[PDB]
RNA sequence: CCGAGGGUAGGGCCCGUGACUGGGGCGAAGUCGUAACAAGGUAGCUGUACCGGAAGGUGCGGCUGGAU
RNA sequence: UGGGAGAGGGUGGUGGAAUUCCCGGAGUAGCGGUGAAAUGCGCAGAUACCGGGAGGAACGCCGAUGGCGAAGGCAGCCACCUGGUCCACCCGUGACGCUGAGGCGCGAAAGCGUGGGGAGCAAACCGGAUUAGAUACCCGGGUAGUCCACGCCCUAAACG
RNA sequence: CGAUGUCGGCUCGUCGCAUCCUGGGGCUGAAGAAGGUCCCAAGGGUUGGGCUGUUCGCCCAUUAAAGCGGCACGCGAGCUG
RNA sequence: GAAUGCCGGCAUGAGUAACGAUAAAGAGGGUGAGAAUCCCUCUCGCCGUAAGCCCAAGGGUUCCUACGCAAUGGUCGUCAGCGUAGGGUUAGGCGGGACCUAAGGUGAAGCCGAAAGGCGUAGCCGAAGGGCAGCCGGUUAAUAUUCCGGCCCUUCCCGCAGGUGCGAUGGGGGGACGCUCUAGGCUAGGGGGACCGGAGCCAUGGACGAGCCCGGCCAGAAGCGCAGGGUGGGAGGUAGGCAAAUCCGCCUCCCAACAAGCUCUGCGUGGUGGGGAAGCCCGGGUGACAACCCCCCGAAGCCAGGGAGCCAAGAAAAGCCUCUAAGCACAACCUGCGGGAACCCGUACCGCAAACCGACACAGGUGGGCGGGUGCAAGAGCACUCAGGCGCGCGGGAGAACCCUCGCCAAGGAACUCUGCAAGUUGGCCCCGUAACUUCGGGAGAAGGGGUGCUCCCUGGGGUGAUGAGCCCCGGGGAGCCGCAGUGAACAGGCUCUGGCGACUGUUUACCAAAAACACAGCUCUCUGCGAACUCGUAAGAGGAGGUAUAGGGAGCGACGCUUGCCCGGUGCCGGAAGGUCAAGGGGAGGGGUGCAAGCCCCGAACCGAAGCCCCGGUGAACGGCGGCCGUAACUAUAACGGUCCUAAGGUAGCGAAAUUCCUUGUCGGGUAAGUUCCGACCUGCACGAAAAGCGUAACGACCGGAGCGCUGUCUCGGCGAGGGACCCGGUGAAAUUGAACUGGCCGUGAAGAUGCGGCCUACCCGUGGCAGGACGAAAAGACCCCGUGGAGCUUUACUGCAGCC
RNA sequence: GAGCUAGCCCUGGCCAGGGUGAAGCUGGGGUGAGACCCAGUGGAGGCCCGAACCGGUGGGGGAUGCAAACCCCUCGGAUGA
């Protein structure tokens, strides 16, 4: 049956992407946290 | 004269349609239409704020002239009478001798070919618009402004009309479609005659489908819900109201008056509606 | 081939009968009231409608085949 | 051909009196109702009186033992559309007539459907009386309906 | 109660005997035939169907008879539901 | 040493289950250390509205080649989507961008919010919508509308020539639109040809033939031809299209008008460039100087912005054209021609799947296009089959029980069971024929029945031609032939009578309920006069609605028919300028603290002072409610009638043992041999009843009852057969569970059901296939039940607040 | 977090084939004119049968699954809410 993950590159970048995160106070707190933790990727990889 | 159907389906048995006899032109003036942006009953937050709306036929908005005092003295020929999906009245295409074209709501008895005009000096004839103070006491009227130059607000629905009952200084007394008696400023414009398509109210939708075509989604009873949802929700099996009949939001819905008490227009309303 | 008739199926008419039910006629030695005949104690009768334990009442309109 | 009378019919308009209600004024202790009462209304200002307004229905006098229509039935006044009918002339047609099973149309009131309208009145209904009782008569309320449009219903002491 | 799945049916039995039938007896208000009542006896047998979830029960047609109980009201790591 | 402890390791179950669709395999040859599994050939099977082909997502080198086989691959592996390495993706014209706008998002101005931030006309961003110039063929191991070849085209720049009042982000036109049905002419695609081209074949009894088999086209500028789309022309007036306007709009006049003309598209032809089969020869050569023609069928595609009908009335903006404004009129623009210029990103490969989503090379899920042929009435259905692709990554035997899926069955025919559950029956088309009832549509495919293949003869209309032959389509009438059987296979309703509920088509608990539940047209109450009421938001702002009482919100009821009674004392709501009560505030009689004092400070009565409540009234399709006792009639029985207690008032019409009835399987009637169910009745209705509607109702229902016919392995009552497993051999090899075990019966005992205690009985050691009675077997710290001053959802005239309103 | 699911908004796309045969229109009949009747034409509909497609009715299988909802048979809708 139809499962939950239905990959869509525009949807991914537009929802979790760097510019989405920077636009919002919560989103910037995510980036700060992920940079402080030392994450190698701040934002989901998506191919464009 | 509403049109009936033979019962060749369970729904055609009751369905009735308007006869569309007054309609002379089946395409709108391209320069007088603009897209009607459908809301689904959602506001700018994206929230439903009027339930059960959406999914109706696509519609173009016809720009309607609700001023008229806009072109005083300039006669216009009634070019056509057309269907407007956005209102119950029919609409009439005016060709001003100006070359300007506009729509008005079609009055009862308006004939294509006839001439209409707006202004204090207009003849008292169906389709003409005048300030209320120059319209003879007793004549029935429509598309009435509520305040001068703010545009026609009153008696616009199919078949409706207001009647001039008398004059009192700067104001004139109207009987509104609702039977409410009200002072309206004399400089307010109105159009003589009643709104056309009076048979509108005799239409029988006939089937659920027809409501959907109109953008009305199914309405679900409070009694059909659960207590999280509604005052009437819950109960084992069917249940009576079990409290004063209430809205989804808890206010009472049988008789509870809701017009604001200290409203400034109360000074202008002579007698509340009938029936 | 046709064919008495037999068989399958489906209709039409008529008769008898049926738990129960509707009113009707007769009976009369009962109960309730007394609607009509007198102006019958609300003049009567009437088509219709609604109503009442009952006869009946009332509305609307009609007739005189109504006493004074 | 020339005239006449008429609430004959249909449609659109329009007038006045009265009832009710609403507004303003003025005023006070009752009003209403009946055989007599009571319910009811009224000091939260009724009734009676004056001015203003809204609205529906019916048309006083004329009016008659009257007129018109096939019957049902038709009554303020104006206009338009339209039927029947009588008279005089004795001009035209030349028996073209009478009736009429079926058919078709019309058909008071009540009633029905859809929509309007709703003042007064008033089935049902509620209350007061009356009465032995009173699901009545009388009284105070009161919804259909009574009115308009369209469609049905097709009855009658539809009687001379 | 860190679980012993609860009615009824089906399947499969097995046991008790306070015995429904068949076998053996005594008494009889046992003439015979047929019964009644008690005693011995558990080897075998103890039907099909209508109703109802039913167990039970009532009914139809038979029968030598159409027994009653126990086995976690036997049997859901066997089925049904 | 225990915490169903934590981490790790390793056991048991066990050589056990399983190895992932029952589309299927066999042999020969090759390679190699090794071969059922890799390559090649032949044979066999399976898909073929796909299990083939192309595109978009998504994936991201999985593509190609060489070399490999430890691991990955459910076995094997020499193979591979695996390891290593090298190679491979070529664009002005395809897609997206340097164009447009849609929802929406952002947001100059502007508005709002403690902060963060929320809005917001314009503008901007935003596509799979609009717009825009490339087709055919060849080539690589691997890309190709991209490279090449042929023939076409677009924009930009510059120049030349001719032409013109040129010029725009401004005005206007246009772009520009639905659903259903549909005409004409075409193309795609397909069938046939006794005609054209072709390697060859004559078998096994016959055929050297009008034989078999194969193929018989593709792209193409200008021109031309056919079919269509689009558009009237001239003048005069002009006050409107936020300036201007010669444009557009409006008015008038004059020619024109199912015409033409002008224009644009489609199809045909077209210089030219290509392609080109079977067969047997080793992807390539030959076939071949290939031929390339006629007829028929024919779209849902094209002409297209075509036509008609209908109501629910069907985007925008740019490109484009026209108009003018500043300007500028040596410019500028337009037309033609010529030369130059023409950027960025994508392009491999998988793509209904072993490369995407499902932890797996997972029987699941995934949008668009092509999807041949024959026959079956049609069709994308069904059967077979083309092209193309596959045999599903463990096999080999055996021929038990039992399981699955399947086939048949004597006699019976629902006796099965909760229930005909399941499975039979029926089954397409043509014809005949068809009841109650009905809202006149229907019910209806009612029911029921007849026909159905093939051969010959005669004949009727239509399409394409030409009016004819041919082809193709739709018929009719005779006479015959064969079989058990002619929709001969495959796909394809069992039916009837009668109740309950819901009017109906719809909707629902994704993953235990599809229903009688929700919705629904429709009915009624009620609110709302517009800056509406109501909803979301602190607000601004939005929805409502660019709507206006024939409208919008809320509530109940639920097509339709016939109806919807009585009670307004309580609660609700509505009305009531009286009166009672009533907070802050006003008021300040009187009293107090303090000071030598003027003074300062405090308390405080009458009185005035809202909504709310009280109080008066209205109101039921507002919340709701709708009795009891005694007595009475020519036999009994009953009680029309009378009396009395109580109430706000005492259940009307209709219905009733009911989706409601406890007693209950009520009683009676029907059906049955027999009927706790069913249907019809009765009425002492435990405990119906009128919009939480009452009683009915044609049609409808994968709803729930009852009956009958047909037919059956449901059953009496079981038998046999098939395949996939189970079993055996080779390969690979889990799991929950497990205190340890050397783990028998009975009668007892024992914390009350003992392999483990006592007594007795029985018992050589170890497995394999089977069965489930026990191990109070496994699983899940019982979900019932209680307990905890544990939690959470819900309610209200519980308490206390808060929003909101007054 | 609405790449699952629910609703709405914008823009596209899809629905083989067959059946029934509403209004309207034409002709005929009918009438004073009408209503209306008959025939042909027509092609309506939350119409009918049935694929794709959307579902998920009953049974069977599956139950350490092919699968944390699947498989077979059967069955609902299929121009419309
Ligand atoms: Mg998706
Ligand atoms: Mg992904
Ligand atoms: Mg994307
Ligand atoms: Mg995308
Ligand atoms: Mg997206
Ligand atoms: Mg982003
Ligand atoms: Mg990481
Ligand atoms: Mg790093
Ligand atoms: Mg992140
Ligand atoms: Mg009309
Ligand atoms: Mg009709
Ligand atoms: Mg109708
Ligand atoms: Mg019709
Ligand atoms: Mg119907
Ligand atoms: Mg119409
Ligand atoms: Mg009209
Ligand atoms: Mg249109
Ligand atoms: Mg526009
Ligand atoms: Mg708009
Ligand atoms: Mg809008
Ligand atoms: Mg927004
Ligand atoms: Mg938002
Ligand atoms: Mg709402
Ligand atoms: Mg809504
Ligand atoms: Mg309109
Ligand atoms: Mg209308
Ligand atoms: Mg209606
Ligand atoms: Mg609409
Ligand atoms: Mg609605
Ligand atoms: Mg509802
Ligand atoms: Mg519920
Ligand atoms: Mg919630
Ligand atoms: Mg609540
Ligand atoms: Mg409730
Ligand atoms: Mg309840
Ligand atoms: Mg409930
Ligand atoms: Mg209940
Ligand atoms: Mg409920
Ligand atoms: Mg309920
Ligand atoms: Mg319910
Ligand atoms: Mg209630
Ligand atoms: Mg309740
Ligand atoms: Mg209650
Ligand atoms: Mg409120
Ligand atoms: Mg105002
Ligand atoms: Mg015989
Ligand atoms: Mg009398
Ligand atoms: Mg008397
Ligand atoms: Mg009398
Ligand atoms: Mg009565
Ligand atoms: Mg009585
Ligand atoms: Mg009475
Ligand atoms: Mg009379
Ligand atoms: Mg008189
Ligand atoms: Mg007279
Ligand atoms: Mg003469
Ligand atoms: Mg009459
Ligand atoms: Mg009447
Ligand atoms: Mg009234
Ligand atoms: Mg009495
Ligand atoms: Mg009534
Ligand atoms: Mg009525
Ligand atoms: Mg326990
Ligand atoms: Mg345990
Ligand atoms: Mg356990
Ligand atoms: Mg004897
Ligand atoms: Mg003895
Ligand atoms: Mg024995
Ligand atoms: Mg024994
Ligand atoms: Mg029994
Ligand atoms: Mg019993
Ligand atoms: Mg009994
Ligand atoms: Mg015997
Ligand atoms: Mg026992
Ligand atoms: Mg017991
Ligand atoms: Mg017991
Ligand atoms: Mg037991
Ligand atoms: Mg037992
Ligand atoms: Mg048991
Ligand atoms: Mg079980
Ligand atoms: Mg059991
Ligand atoms: Mg067990
Ligand atoms: Mg067991
Ligand atoms: Mg067990
Ligand atoms: Mg069972
Ligand atoms: Mg159960
Ligand atoms: Mg310890
Ligand atoms: Mg453990
Ligand atoms: Mg453990
Ligand atoms: Mg542990
Ligand atoms: Mg651990
Ligand atoms: Mg070990
Ligand atoms: Mg084992
Ligand atoms: Mg091998
Ligand atoms: Mg090997
Ligand atoms: Mg090979
Ligand atoms: Mg095949
Ligand atoms: Mg095929
Ligand atoms: Mg991946
Ligand atoms: Mg490649
Ligand atoms: Mg590679
Ligand atoms: Mg390997
Ligand atoms: Mg290996
Ligand atoms: Mg190896
Ligand atoms: Mg491996
Ligand atoms: Mg694997
Ligand atoms: Mg090797
Ligand atoms: Mg591989
Ligand atoms: Mg290489
Ligand atoms: Mg190129
Ligand atoms: Mg550029
Ligand atoms: Mg853009
Ligand atoms: Mg685009
Ligand atoms: Mg392009
Ligand atoms: Mg080209
Ligand atoms: Mg390549
Ligand atoms: Mg448009
Ligand atoms: Mg469009
Ligand atoms: Mg449609
Ligand atoms: Mg055509
Ligand atoms: Mg072509
Ligand atoms: Mg063909
Ligand atoms: Mg030979
Ligand atoms: Mg042509
Ligand atoms: Mg001008
Ligand atoms: Mg070749
Ligand atoms: Mg050659
Ligand atoms: Mg040659
Ligand atoms: Mg089509
Ligand atoms: Mg409409
Ligand atoms: Mg726009
Ligand atoms: Mg200048
Ligand atoms: Mg030019
Ligand atoms: Mg660039
Ligand atoms: Mg490529
Ligand atoms: Mg698939
Ligand atoms: Mg996942
Ligand atoms: Mg595999
Ligand atoms: Mg797969
Ligand atoms: Mg093809
Ligand atoms: Mg077939
Ligand atoms: Mg077929
Ligand atoms: Mg099929
Ligand atoms: Mg083939
Ligand atoms: Mg295989
Ligand atoms: Mg074996
Ligand atoms: Mg199979
Ligand atoms: Mg048999
Ligand atoms: Mg039978
Ligand atoms: Mg039989
Ligand atoms: Mg049954
Ligand atoms: Mg079949
Ligand atoms: Mg019948
Ligand atoms: Mg009929
Ligand atoms: Mg029907
Ligand atoms: Mg048949
Ligand atoms: Mg039937
Ligand atoms: Mg044959
Ligand atoms: Mg056969
Ligand atoms: Mg098949
Ligand atoms: Mg069928
Ligand atoms: Mg059956
Ligand atoms: Mg029946
Ligand atoms: Mg019902
Ligand atoms: Mg239903
Ligand atoms: Mg339902
Ligand atoms: Mg109904
Ligand atoms: Mg309904
Ligand atoms: Mg329904
Ligand atoms: Mg449907
Ligand atoms: Mg659930
Ligand atoms: Mg469910
Ligand atoms: Mg769940
Ligand atoms: Mg669930
Ligand atoms: Mg289920
Ligand atoms: Mg369900
Ligand atoms: Mg269903
Ligand atoms: Mg529901
Ligand atoms: Mg419902
Ligand atoms: Mg109703
Ligand atoms: Mg709020
Ligand atoms: Mg706003
Ligand atoms: Mg708004
Ligand atoms: Mg708006
Ligand atoms: Mg509105
Ligand atoms: Mg409902
Ligand atoms: Mg009826
Ligand atoms: Mg009350
Ligand atoms: Mg009250
Ligand atoms: Mg009272
Ligand atoms: Mg209460
Ligand atoms: Mg009040
Ligand atoms: Mg006073
Ligand atoms: Mg003082
Ligand atoms: Mg002192
Ligand atoms: Mg007060
Ligand atoms: Mg009422
Ligand atoms: Mg009460
Ligand atoms: Mg109530
Ligand atoms: Mg007596
Ligand atoms: Mg009762
Ligand atoms: Mg009553
Ligand atoms: Mg009963
Ligand atoms: Mg009942
Ligand atoms: Mg009950
Ligand atoms: Mg009880
Ligand atoms: Mg009972
Ligand atoms: Mg019982
Ligand atoms: Mg019984
Ligand atoms: Mg039963
Ligand atoms: Mg039952
Ligand atoms: Mg009884
Ligand atoms: Mg309710
Ligand atoms: Mg109910
Ligand atoms: Mg009720
Ligand atoms: Mg009923
Ligand atoms: Mg249904
Ligand atoms: Mg159903
Ligand atoms: Mg069997
Ligand atoms: Mg066999
Ligand atoms: Mg076998
Ligand atoms: Mg086998
Ligand atoms: Mg076998
Ligand atoms: Mg062996
Ligand atoms: Mg040991
Ligand atoms: Mg023990
Ligand atoms: Mg023991
Ligand atoms: Mg032992
Ligand atoms: Mg020991
Ligand atoms: Mg011991
Ligand atoms: Mg021992
Ligand atoms: Mg022993
Ligand atoms: Mg066991
Ligand atoms: Mg044990
Ligand atoms: Mg056990
Ligand atoms: Mg056990
Ligand atoms: Mg468990
Ligand atoms: Mg638990
Ligand atoms: Mg725990
Ligand atoms: Mg526990
Ligand atoms: Mg517990
Ligand atoms: Mg639970
Ligand atoms: Mg307990
Ligand atoms: Mg406590
Ligand atoms: Mg405690
Ligand atoms: Mg709590
Ligand atoms: Mg669209
Ligand atoms: Mg679309
Ligand atoms: Mg379809
Ligand atoms: Mg036809
Ligand atoms: Mg037409
Ligand atoms: Mg349909
Ligand atoms: Mg259909
Ligand atoms: Mg259908
Ligand atoms: Mg299923
Ligand atoms: Mg089945
Ligand atoms: Mg089976
Ligand atoms: Mg499962
Ligand atoms: Mg399946
Ligand atoms: Mg299946
Ligand atoms: Mg089917
Ligand atoms: Mg269907
Ligand atoms: Mg279809
Ligand atoms: Mg449908
Ligand atoms: Mg639609």
Swiss-Prot record, chain A:
Keywords, comma-separated and alphabetical: Ribonucleoprotein, Ribosomal protein
Basic residues bias: start-end ranges: 29-48
Key word Metal-binding present: no
Cited Pfam families: Ribosomal_L34
GO CC, any one term: ribonucleoprotein complex
GO biological process, one term: translation
Keyword ATP-binding: no
Sequence segments annotated as region (Disordered): 26-48
A GO MF label: structural constituent of ribosome
Miscellaneous notes: The open reading frame (ORF) for this protein is entirely within the ORF for the RNase P protein (RnaP). The two start codons are separated by four nucleotides.
Self-association state and partner proteins as the record states: Part of the 50S ribosomal subunit.
Its biological purpose: Found on the solvent side of the large subunit.
Family stated for the protein in its record: Belongs to the bacterial ribosomal protein bL34 family.
Protein name: Large ribosomal subunit protein bL34
From Swiss-Prot, chain B:
Biased composition (Basic and acidic residues): 229-239
Biased composition (Basic residues): 256-275
PROSITE patterns named in the record: RIBOSOMAL_L2
Positions of region (Disordered): 222-275
Gene Ontology molecular function: rRNA binding; structural constituent of ribosome; transferase activity
Keywords from the UniProt entry: Ribonucleoprotein, Ribosomal protein, RNA-binding, rRNA-binding
Superkingdom classification of source: Bacteria
Gene3D superfamilies: 2.30.30.30, Nucleic acid-binding proteins (2.40.50.140), Ribosomal protein L2, domain 3 (4.10.950.10)
InterPro entries on file: NA-bd_OB-fold (IPR012340), Rib_uL2_dom2 (IPR014722), Ribosomal_uL2 (IPR002171), Ribosomal_uL2_bac/org-type (IPR005880), Ribosomal_uL2_C (IPR022669), Ribosomal_uL2_CS (IPR022671), Ribosomal_uL2_dom3 (IPR014726), Ribosomal_uL2_RNA-bd_dom (IPR022666)
GO cellular component, one term: large ribosomal subunit
Gene Ontology BP, a term: cytoplasmic translation
HAMAP family xref list: Ribosomal_uL2_B
Biological role stated in the UniProt entry: One of the primary rRNA binding proteins. Required for association of the 30S and 50S subunits to form the 70S ribosome, for tRNA binding and peptide bond formation. It has been suggested to have peptidyltransferase activity; this is somewhat controversial. Makes several contacts with the 16S rRNA (forming bridge B7b) in the 70S ribosome.
Assembly: Part of the 50S ribosomal subunit. Forms a bridge to the 30S subunit in the 70S ribosome, contacting the 16S rRNA. May also make transient contacts with protein S6 during translation in the 70S ribosome.
Family: Belongs to the universal ribosomal protein uL2 family.
Name of the protein in question: Large ribosomal subunit protein uL2
